[PDB]
Short mmCIF file of C-alpha atoms and ligand atoms in Angstrom, two decimals:
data_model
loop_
_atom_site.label_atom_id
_atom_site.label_comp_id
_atom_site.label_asym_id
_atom_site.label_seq_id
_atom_site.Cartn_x
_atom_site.Cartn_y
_atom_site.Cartn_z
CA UNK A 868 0.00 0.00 0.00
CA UNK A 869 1.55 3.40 -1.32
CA UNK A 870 -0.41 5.19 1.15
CA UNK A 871 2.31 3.58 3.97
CA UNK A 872 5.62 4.00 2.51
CA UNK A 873 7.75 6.63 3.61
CA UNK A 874 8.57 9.31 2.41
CA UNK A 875 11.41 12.35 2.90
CA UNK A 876 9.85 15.97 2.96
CA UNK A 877 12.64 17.50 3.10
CA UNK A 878 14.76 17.54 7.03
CA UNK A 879 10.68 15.40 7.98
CA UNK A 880 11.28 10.95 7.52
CA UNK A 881 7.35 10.53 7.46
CA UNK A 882 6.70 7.11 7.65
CA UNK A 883 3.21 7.64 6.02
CA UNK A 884 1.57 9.60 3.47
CA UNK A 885 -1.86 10.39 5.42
CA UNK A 886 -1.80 14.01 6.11
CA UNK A 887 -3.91 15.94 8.19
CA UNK A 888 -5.70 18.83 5.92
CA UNK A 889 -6.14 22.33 7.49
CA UNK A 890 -9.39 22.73 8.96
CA UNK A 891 -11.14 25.37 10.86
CA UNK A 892 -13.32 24.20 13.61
CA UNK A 893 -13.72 26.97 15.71
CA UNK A 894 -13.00 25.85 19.06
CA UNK A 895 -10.27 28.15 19.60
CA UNK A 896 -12.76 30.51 21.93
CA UNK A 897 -11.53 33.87 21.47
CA UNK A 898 -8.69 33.25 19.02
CA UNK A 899 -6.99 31.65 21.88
CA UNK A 900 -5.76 27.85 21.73
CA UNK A 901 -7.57 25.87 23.68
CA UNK A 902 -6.79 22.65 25.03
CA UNK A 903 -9.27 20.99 23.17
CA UNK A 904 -7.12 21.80 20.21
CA UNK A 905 -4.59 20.02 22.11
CA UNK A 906 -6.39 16.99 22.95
CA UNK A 907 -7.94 16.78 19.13
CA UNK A 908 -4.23 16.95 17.28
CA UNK A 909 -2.77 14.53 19.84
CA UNK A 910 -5.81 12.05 19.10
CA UNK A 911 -4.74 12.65 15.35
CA UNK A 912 -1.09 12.58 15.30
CA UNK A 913 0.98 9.88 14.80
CA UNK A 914 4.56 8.62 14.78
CA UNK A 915 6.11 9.84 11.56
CA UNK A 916 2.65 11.30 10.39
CA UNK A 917 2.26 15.20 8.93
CA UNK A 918 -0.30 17.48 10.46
CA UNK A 919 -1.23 20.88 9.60
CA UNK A 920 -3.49 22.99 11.71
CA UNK A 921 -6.25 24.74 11.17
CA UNK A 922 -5.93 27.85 9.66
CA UNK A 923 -4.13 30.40 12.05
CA UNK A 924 -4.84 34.36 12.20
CA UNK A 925 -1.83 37.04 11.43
CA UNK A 926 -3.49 39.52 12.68
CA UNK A 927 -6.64 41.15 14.23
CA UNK A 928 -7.95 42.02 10.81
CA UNK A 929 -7.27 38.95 9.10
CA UNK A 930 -10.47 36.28 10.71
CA UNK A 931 -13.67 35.82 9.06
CA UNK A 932 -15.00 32.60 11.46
CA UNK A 933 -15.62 32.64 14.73
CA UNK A 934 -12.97 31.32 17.46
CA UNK A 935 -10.22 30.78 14.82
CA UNK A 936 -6.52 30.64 16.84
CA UNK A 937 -4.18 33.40 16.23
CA UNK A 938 -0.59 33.38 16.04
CA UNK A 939 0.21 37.08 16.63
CA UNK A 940 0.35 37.06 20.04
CA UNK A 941 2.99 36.18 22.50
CA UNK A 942 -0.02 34.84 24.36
CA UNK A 943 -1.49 32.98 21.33
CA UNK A 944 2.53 31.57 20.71
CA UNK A 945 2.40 29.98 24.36
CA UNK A 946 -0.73 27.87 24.25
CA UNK A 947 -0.09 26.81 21.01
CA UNK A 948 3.43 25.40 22.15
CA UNK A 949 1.21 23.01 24.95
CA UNK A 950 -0.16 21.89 21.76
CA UNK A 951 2.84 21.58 19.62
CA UNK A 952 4.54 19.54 22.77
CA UNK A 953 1.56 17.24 22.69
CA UNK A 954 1.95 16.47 19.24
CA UNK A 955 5.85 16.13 18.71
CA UNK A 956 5.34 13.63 21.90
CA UNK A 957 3.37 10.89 19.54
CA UNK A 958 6.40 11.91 17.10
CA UNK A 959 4.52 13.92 14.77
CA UNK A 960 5.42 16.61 12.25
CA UNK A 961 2.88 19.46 12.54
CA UNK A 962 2.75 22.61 10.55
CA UNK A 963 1.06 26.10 11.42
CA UNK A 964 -0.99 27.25 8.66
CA UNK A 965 -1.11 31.28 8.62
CA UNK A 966 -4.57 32.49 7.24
CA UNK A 967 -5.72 35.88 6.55
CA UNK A 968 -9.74 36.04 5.03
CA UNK A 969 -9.62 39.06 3.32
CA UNK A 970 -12.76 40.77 1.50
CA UNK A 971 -14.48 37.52 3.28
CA UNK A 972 -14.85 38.61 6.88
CA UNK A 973 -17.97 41.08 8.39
CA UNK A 974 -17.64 43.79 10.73
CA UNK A 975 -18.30 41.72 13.66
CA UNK A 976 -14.92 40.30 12.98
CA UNK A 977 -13.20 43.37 12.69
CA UNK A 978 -11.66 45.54 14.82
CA UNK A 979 -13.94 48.67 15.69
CA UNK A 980 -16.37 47.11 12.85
CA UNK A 981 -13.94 48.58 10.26
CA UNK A 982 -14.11 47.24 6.57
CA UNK A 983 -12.51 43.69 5.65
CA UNK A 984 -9.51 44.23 3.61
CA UNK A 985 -8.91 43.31 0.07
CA UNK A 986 -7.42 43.39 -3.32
CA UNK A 987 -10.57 45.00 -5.06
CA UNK A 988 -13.34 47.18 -3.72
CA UNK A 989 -15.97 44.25 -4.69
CA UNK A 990 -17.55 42.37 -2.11
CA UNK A 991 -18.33 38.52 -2.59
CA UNK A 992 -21.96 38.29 -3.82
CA UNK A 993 -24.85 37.39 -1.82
CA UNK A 994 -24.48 33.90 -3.06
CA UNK A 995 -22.15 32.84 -0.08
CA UNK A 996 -23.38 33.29 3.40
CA UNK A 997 -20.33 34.14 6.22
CA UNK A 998 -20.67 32.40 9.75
CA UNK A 999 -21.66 34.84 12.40
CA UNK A 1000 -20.83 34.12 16.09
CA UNK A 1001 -24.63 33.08 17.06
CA UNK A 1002 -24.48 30.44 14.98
CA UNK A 1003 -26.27 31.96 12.17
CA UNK A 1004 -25.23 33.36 8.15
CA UNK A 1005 -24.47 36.87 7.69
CA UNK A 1006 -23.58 38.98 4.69
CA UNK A 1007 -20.18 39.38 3.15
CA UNK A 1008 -19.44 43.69 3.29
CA UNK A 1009 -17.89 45.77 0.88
CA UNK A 1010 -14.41 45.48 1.67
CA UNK A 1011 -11.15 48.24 1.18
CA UNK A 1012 -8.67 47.85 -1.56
CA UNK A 1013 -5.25 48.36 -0.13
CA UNK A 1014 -2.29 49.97 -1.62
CA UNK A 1015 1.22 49.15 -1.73
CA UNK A 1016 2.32 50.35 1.57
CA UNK A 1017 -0.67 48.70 2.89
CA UNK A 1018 0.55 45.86 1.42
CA UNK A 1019 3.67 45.58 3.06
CA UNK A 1020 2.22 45.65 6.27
CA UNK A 1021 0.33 42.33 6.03
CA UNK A 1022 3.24 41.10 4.25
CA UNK A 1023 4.58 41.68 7.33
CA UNK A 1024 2.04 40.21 9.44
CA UNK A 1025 3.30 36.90 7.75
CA UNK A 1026 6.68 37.32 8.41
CA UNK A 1027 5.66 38.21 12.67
CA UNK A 1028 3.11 35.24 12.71
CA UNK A 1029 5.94 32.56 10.98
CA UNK A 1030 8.70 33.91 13.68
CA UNK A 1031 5.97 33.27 16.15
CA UNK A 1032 5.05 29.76 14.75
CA UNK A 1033 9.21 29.30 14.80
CA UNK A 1034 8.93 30.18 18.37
CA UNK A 1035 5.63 28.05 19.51
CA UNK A 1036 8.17 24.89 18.02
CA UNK A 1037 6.10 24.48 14.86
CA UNK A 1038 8.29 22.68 11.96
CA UNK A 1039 7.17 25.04 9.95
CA UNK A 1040 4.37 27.48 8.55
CA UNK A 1041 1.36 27.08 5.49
CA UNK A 1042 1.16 30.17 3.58
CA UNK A 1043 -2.90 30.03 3.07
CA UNK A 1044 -3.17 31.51 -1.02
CA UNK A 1045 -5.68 29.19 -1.70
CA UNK A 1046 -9.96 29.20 -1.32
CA UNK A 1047 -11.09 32.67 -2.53
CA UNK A 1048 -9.09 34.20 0.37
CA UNK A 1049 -6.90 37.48 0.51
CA UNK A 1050 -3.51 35.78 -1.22
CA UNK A 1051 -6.12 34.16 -3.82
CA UNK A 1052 -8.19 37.61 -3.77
CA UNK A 1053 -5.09 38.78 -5.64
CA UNK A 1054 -4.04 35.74 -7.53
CA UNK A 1055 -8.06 34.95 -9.20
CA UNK A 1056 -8.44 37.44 -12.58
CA UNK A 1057 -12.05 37.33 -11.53
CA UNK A 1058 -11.78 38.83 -8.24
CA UNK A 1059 -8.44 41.48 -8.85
CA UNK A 1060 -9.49 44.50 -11.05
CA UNK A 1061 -6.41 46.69 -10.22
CA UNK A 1062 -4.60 48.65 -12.27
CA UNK A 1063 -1.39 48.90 -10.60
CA UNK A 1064 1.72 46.48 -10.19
CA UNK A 1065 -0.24 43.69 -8.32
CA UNK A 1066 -3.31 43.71 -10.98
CA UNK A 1067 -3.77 42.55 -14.79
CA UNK A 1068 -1.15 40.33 -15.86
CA UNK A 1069 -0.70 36.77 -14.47
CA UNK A 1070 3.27 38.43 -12.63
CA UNK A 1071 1.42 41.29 -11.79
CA UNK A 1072 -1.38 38.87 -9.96
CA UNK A 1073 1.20 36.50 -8.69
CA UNK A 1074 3.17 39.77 -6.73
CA UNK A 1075 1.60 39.51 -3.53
CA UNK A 1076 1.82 35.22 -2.66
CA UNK A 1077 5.20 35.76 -4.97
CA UNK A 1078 6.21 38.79 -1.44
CA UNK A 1079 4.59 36.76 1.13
CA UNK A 1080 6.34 33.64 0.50
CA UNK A 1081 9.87 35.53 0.00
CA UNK A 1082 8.80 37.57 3.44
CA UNK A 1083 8.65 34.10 5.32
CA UNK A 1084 11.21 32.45 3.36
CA UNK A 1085 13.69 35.22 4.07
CA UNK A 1086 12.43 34.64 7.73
CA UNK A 1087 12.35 30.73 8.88
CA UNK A 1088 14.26 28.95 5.23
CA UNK A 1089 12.54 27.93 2.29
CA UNK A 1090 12.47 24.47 4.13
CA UNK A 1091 9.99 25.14 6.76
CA UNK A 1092 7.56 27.09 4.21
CA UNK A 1093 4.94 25.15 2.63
CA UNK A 1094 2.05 26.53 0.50
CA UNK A 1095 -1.15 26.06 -0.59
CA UNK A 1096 -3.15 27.38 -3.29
CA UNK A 1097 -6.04 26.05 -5.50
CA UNK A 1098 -6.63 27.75 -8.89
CA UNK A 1099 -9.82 25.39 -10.08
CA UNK A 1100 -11.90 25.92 -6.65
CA UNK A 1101 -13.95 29.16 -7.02
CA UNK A 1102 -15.01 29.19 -3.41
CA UNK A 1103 -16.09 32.68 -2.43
CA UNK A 1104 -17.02 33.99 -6.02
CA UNK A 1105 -13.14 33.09 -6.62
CA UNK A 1106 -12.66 31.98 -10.30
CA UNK A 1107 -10.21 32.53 -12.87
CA UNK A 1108 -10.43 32.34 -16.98
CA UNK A 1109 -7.60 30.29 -17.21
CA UNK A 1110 -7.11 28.01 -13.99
CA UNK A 1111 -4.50 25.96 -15.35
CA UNK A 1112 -2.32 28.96 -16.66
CA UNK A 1113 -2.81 30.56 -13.43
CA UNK A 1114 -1.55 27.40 -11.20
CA UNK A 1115 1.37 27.31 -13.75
CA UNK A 1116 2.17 30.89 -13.40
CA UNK A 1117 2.11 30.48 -9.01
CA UNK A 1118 4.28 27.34 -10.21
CA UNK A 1119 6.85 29.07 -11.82
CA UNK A 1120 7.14 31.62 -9.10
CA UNK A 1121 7.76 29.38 -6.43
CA UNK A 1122 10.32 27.28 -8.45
CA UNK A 1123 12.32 30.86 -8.92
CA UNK A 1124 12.41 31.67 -5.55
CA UNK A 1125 13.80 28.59 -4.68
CA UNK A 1126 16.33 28.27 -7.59
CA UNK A 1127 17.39 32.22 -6.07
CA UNK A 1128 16.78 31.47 -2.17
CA UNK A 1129 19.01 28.45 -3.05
CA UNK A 1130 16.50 25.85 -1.47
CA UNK A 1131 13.16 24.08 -2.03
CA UNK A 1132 10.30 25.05 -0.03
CA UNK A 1133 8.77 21.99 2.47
CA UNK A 1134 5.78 21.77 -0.67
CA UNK A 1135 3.41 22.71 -2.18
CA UNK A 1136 -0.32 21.91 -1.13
CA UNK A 1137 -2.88 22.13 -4.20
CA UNK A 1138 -6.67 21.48 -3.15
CA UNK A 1139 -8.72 20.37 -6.45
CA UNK A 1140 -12.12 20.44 -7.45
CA UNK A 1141 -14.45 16.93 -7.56
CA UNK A 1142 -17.10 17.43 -10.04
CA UNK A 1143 -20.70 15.55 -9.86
CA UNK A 1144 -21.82 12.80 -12.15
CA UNK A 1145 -25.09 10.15 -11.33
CA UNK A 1146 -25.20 7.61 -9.16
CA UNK A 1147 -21.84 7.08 -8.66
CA UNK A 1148 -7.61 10.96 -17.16
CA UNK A 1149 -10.11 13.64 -16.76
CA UNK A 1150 -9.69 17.57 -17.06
CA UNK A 1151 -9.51 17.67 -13.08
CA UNK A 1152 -7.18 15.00 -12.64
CA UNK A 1153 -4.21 15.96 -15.57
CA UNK A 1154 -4.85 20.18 -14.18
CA UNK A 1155 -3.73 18.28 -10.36
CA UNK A 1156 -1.03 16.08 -12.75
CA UNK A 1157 -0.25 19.51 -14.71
CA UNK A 1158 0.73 21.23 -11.24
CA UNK A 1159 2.82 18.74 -9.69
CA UNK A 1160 4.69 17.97 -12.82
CA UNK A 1161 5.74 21.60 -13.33
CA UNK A 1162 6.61 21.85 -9.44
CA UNK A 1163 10.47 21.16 -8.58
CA UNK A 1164 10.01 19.72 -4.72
CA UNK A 1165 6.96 17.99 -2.56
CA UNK A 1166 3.54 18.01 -3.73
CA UNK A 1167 0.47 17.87 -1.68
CA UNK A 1168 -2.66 17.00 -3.22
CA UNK A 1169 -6.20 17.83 -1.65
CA UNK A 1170 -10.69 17.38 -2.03
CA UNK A 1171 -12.57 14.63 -1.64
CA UNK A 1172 -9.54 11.85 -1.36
CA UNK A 1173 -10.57 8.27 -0.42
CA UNK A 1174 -8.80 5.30 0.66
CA UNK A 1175 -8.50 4.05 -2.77
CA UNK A 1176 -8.24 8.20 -4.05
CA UNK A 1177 -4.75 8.21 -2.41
CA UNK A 1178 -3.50 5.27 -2.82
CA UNK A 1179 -3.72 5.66 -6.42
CA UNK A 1180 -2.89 9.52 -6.58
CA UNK A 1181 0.59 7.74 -4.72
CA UNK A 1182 0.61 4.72 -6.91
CA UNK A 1183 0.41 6.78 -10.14
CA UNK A 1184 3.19 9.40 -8.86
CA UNK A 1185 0.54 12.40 -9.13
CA UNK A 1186 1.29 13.11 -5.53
CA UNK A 1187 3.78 12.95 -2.58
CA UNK A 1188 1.65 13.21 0.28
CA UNK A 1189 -2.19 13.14 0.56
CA UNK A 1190 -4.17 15.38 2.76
CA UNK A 1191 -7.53 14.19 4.06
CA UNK A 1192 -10.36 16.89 5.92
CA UNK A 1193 -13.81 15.56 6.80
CA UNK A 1194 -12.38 11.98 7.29
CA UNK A 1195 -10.34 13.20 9.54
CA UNK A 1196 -13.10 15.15 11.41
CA UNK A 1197 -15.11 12.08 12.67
CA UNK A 1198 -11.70 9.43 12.87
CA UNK A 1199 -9.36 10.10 14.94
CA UNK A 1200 -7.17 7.38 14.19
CA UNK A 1201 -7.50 7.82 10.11
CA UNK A 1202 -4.40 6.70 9.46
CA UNK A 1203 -4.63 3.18 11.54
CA UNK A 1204 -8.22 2.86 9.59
CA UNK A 1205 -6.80 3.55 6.27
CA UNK A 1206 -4.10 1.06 6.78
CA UNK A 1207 -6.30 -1.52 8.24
CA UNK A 1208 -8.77 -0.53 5.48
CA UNK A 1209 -11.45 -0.60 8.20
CA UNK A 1210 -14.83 1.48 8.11
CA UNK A 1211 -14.66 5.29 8.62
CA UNK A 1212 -17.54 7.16 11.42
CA UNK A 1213 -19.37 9.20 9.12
CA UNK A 1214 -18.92 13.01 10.24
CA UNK A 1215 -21.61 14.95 11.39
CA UNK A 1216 -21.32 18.72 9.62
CA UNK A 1217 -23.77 20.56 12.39
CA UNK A 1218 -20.48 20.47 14.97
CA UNK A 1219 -18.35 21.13 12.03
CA UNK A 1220 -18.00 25.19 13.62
CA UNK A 1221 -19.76 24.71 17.15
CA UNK A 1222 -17.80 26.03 20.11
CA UNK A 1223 -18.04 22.88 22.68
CA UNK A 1224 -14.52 21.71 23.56
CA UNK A 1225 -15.39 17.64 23.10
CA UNK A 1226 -18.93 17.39 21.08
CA UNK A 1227 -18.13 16.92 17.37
CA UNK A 1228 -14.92 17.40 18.02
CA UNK A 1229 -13.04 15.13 20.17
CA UNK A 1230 -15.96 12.35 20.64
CA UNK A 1231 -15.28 10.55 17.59
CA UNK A 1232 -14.58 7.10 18.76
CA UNK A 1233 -11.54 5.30 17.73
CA UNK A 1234 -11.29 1.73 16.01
CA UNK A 1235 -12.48 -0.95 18.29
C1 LIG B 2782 -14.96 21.94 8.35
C2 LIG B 2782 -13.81 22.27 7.38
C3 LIG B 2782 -12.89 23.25 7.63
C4 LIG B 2782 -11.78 23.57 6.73
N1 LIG B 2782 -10.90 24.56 7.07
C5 LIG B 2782 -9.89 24.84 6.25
C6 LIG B 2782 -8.91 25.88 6.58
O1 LIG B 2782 -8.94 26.56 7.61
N2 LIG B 2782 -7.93 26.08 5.67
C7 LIG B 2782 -7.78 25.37 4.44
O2 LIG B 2782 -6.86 25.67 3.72
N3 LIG B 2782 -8.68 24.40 4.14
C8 LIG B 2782 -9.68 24.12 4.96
N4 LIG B 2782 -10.59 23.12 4.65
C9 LIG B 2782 -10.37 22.37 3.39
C10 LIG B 2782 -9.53 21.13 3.76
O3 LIG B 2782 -8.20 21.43 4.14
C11 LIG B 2782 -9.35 20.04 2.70
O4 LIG B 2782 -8.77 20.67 1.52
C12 LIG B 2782 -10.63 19.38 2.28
O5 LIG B 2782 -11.33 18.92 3.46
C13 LIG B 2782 -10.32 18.19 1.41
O6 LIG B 2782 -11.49 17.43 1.09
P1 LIG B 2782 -12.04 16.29 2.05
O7 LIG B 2782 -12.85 16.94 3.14
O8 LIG B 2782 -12.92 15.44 1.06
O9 LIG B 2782 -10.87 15.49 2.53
C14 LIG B 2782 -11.68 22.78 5.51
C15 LIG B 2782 -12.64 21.77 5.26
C16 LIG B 2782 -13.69 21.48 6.14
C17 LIG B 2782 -14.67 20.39 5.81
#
């Protein structure tokens, strides 16, 4: 089974290929980790396995759930670390992934209500509903285009939160430019309508993940940098004419600055789209193919994987390392049932964002 041999990402032996995908859960009351984080990674890890977490805030403007963690904190930086120690204990590799939401946040979520910031003036259409902090859907605001200086400063934010994910004893950070989210506010030709350096052309689009990643790069080493992007998913009215061009264009980026920083990043973490037949190689799977093929270093691939899904994305060479979400959600010990190739819980999406510290979140009963 493919899915079980090991593998080298980079400094990281992993002795499997299960990886935990990023996924907010919103436990993390008050952007502060909890120990119910802590208890739900340790469940998770394993010896030699890869986890990333959840998608962690830069700054006070960058959350759009409720309860996300933050990294920009000393505070934040010292619970997380209890959770880092709880992980590396089961001899796990675990990952910090830095998320900032963009035009896709509310004013609740803002400081003093101010506008969510973004690439474009445009706000995401009434199509997509954002999570408010009772529980129910609220609508996505007009947010602020920011200008170069403006820029900077989040670029920044990165570069703080990776020093601080360096300092909670993370192995390393997930540069979040995937999902209709700021980074992929900028990259997406159907979102960014500027006219300046960071608008138009595919360089022009590819400027800000192209400073963000250099930012952190320049900060921790290429070699605890991963990132993740995902130029077919149009999540958050987040499409592009050309998808394939546009992953191809991020590709060719990231190969540079590793060719120039003079080392490869820890990989690169592509989430693809899973179309819908009946009752039951494929554009999809040769754009995923397309990606990794063009990529010099580790390649992550992401949506909808199966037991079978992975072991033939490994089998096939289309991928280094698969990362799994909502089967990790309701089984803990994913990577012992893959193995075993025993039955999978079925996951229960009304505790997918609920605040209680074990229900639908640690409960999930292991393999008897
Ligand atoms: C409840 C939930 C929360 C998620 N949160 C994040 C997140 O914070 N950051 C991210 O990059 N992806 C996030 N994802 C996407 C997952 O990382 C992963 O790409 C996706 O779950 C893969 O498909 P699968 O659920 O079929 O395995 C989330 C998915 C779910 C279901």
């Amino acid at each position: 089974n493919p899915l079980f041999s090991p593998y080298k990402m980079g400094k990281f032996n992993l002795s499997h290929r299960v990886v935990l995908a990023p996924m907010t859960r919103c436990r993390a009351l008050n952007n502060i980790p909890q120990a119910a984080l802590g208890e739900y990674y340790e469940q998770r890890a394993t010896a030699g396995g890869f986890l990333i977490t959840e998608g962690t805030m830069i700054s006070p403007t960058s959350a759009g759930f409720p309860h996300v963690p933050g990294i920009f904190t000393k505070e934040q930086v010292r619970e997380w670390k209890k959770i880092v120690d709880v992980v590396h204990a089961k001899g796990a590799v675990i990952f910090c992934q830095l998320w900032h939401v963009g035009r896709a946040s509310h004013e609740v979520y803002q400081p003093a209500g101010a506008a969510p910031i973004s690439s474009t003036e445009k706000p995401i259409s009434n199509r997509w509903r954002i999570l408010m902090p009772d529980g129910t859907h609220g609508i996505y605001p007009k947010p602020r285009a920011i200008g170069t200086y403006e820029i900077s400063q989040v670029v920044e934010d990165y570069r703080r939160s990776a020093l601080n994910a360096i300092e909670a004893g993370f192995d390393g950070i997930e540069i979040h430019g995937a999902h209709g989210y700021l980074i992929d506010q900028f990259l997406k030709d159907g979102i960014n309508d500027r006219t300046d350096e960071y608008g138009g052309s595919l360089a022009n689009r590819c400027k800000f993940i192209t400073q963000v990643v250099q930012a952190v790069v320049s900060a921790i080493g290429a070699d605890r940098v991963g990132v993740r992007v995902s130029p077919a998913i149009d999540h958050l009215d987040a499409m592009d004419s050309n998808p394939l061009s546009l992953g191809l264009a991020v590709v060719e980026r990231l190969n540079k600055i590793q060719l120039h920083s003079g080392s490869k990043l820890a990989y690169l973490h592509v989430t693809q789209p899973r179309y819908v037949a009946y009752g039951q190689e494929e554009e999809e799977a040769r754009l995923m193919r397309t990606l990794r093929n063009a990529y010099q270093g580790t390649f992550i691939c992401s949506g909808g994987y199966t037991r079978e899904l992975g072991i033939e994305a490994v089998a096939q060479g289309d991928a280094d390392l698969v990362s799994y979400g909502r089967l990790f959600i309701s089984n803990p010990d994913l990577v012992m049932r893959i193995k075993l190739n025993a039955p999978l819980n079925k996951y229960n999406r009304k505790t997918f964002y609920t605040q209680d510290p074990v229900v639908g979140y640690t409960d999930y009963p292991f393999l008897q």
